[PDB]
Ligand binder design. Structure first.
Ligand code: SF4
Ligand code: F3S
Length: 106
């Protein structure tokens, strides 16, 4: 499984969804997650994230491990996002801001 991590929160560029062969991306208000059962590990999405927040499950950073499970949980309750849309309003300022987990919107 591929995993979206902390830097996607309040960027949510959604460039990732256009390259996914199986539409395994689920949409939160200020975040996107990858359904772990549906993701087929092609990694087409990982270069496409400006946030560089997508990671192969085995290479998700030691301090962002919570996100594996979070992708799994939220992918069960969030609607499917298949089309690219415009980034969140102040996305490039928030990009690179650490610890945005505190601000994740359900
Ligand atoms: S690795 Fe491939 S299948 Fe998995 S979420 Fe990314 S684009 Fe979709
Ligand atoms: S910012 Fe998030 S919305 Fe997609 S392009 Fe990167 S994983």
């Amino acid at each position: 499984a591929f995993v979206v991590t902390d830097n996607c929160i309040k960027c949510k560029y959604t460039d990732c969804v256009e390259v996914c062969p199986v539409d395994c991306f689920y949409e939160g208000p200020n975040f996107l997650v990858i359904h772990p059962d549906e993701c087929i590990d092609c990694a087409s999405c990982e270069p496409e994230c400006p946030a560089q927040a997508i990671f192969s499950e085995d290479e998700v950073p030691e301090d962002m491990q919570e996100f594996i499970q979070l992708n799994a949980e939220l992918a069960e309750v969030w609607p499917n996002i298949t089309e690219k849309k415009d980034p969140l309003p102040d996305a490039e300022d928030w990009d690179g801001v650490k610890g945005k987990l505190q601000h994740l919107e359900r």
